[PDB]
UniProtKB/Swiss-Prot annotation, chains A, B, C:
Gene3D superfamilies in alphabetical order: Macrophage Migration Inhibitory Factor (3.30.429.10)
PANTHER family (UniProt xref): D-DOPACHROME DECARBOXYLASE, MACROPHAGE MIGRATION INHIBITORY FACTOR
Catalytic center residues: 1 (proton acceptor)
Record-level GO BP terms: carboxylic acid metabolic process; cell surface receptor signaling pathway; cellular senescence; DNA damage response, signal transduction by p53 class mediator; inflammatory response; innate immune response; negative regulation of apoptotic process; negative regulation of cell migration
Induction profile: Up-regulated in concanavalin-A-treated lymphocytes. Up-regulated in macrophages upon exposure to M.tuberculosis antigens.
Cellular localisation: Secreted; Cytoplasm
Keywords carried by this UniProt record: Acetylation, Cytokine, Cytoplasm, Immunity, Inflammatory response, Innate immunity, Isomerase, Secreted
Residues bearing the modification N6-acetyllysine: 77
GO molecular function, one term: cytokine receptor binding
Lineage, opening ranks: Eukaryota, Metazoa, Chordata, Craniata, Vertebrata
Protein name: Macrophage migration inhibitory factor
Domain of life per record: Eukaryota
Enzyme Commission (EC) number: 5.3.2.1, 5.3.3.12
Length: 114, 114, 114
């Protein structure tokens, strides 16, 4: 899995350990081995949500499987929870796009997962 | 809906009010309330288009519905128009990827839009 | 086609001519004219792969066609090769998401490619 968060929260407000916390909790939520989890946090962004520049986040979670209605609801609770607690972003100012990737469409280690 | 623009145009060349103008015009184009529109502008990027580094943009528009052949042509005219007028980017140096998102595949406020 | 690389490798470690090399190599690999190839490199990113902040990359290749099982394996060998040689990133610390875009879902020059 790959999780990306783009946010207007400044870099200094991203707590130490945040990438590890994301890695751990995503491994647990998706069932995937931690070795396969990639995380990416992009602070200091020029963004607006609902016309407002209050703290917000635009995110994506890509995974080969483990994507669906119930699972995505669970991931959203988890991830909005972390963004609220750690970055002080209101859950109603977060969008997360979920992508169920075909194994043939994910490159890794000179090949694909197909 | 969520609109992201990545560009090599410098930050100082992004005019005051641009995020609001994007929010307003996207609300109108998609027919969705501005409260549901997110916008994200990423200047100063290391990019090339067609082998050269004159102003260019790589963009995405994600929406739950309101995506299709005719609608996307209309969005492209609108968005290229704005990028040309405000950021001085030639329309022939802009790509916009359109994504019709399933409601169950968009997280928001601890759950999804399903 | 459009190729984006997000990496924690610092800007100074990205070789002069990297964007041009990517453009030429992708033109050859996809068979598309270089005029249609866009490339985007984002260094200095806060990211982890497998919980580790050793050099890594999260990438995407979007193309209207020229995406499939065998082609994506070939692209992965090519692009991992380039990231290893030029950015010193291990191929097992690279993800590349492939997207076969519908022509109607790619905006360019005030319209779409449909």
């Amino acid at each position: 899995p790959m999780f990306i968060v783009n946010t207007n929260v400044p870099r200094a407000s991203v707590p130490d350990g945040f990438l590890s916390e994301l890695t751990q909790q995503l491994a647990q939520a998706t069932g995937k081995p931690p070795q396969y989890i990639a995380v990416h946090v992009v602070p200091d962004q020029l963004m607006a949500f609902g016309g407002s520049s209050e703290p917000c986040a635009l995110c994506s979670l890509h995974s080969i499987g483990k994507i669906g209605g119930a699972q995505n609801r669970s991931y959203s609770k988890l991830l909005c929870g972390l963004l609220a607690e750690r970055l002080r972003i209101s859950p109603d100012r977060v969008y997360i796009n979920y992508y169920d990737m075909n194994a043939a469409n994910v490159g890794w280690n000179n090949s694909t997962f197909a």
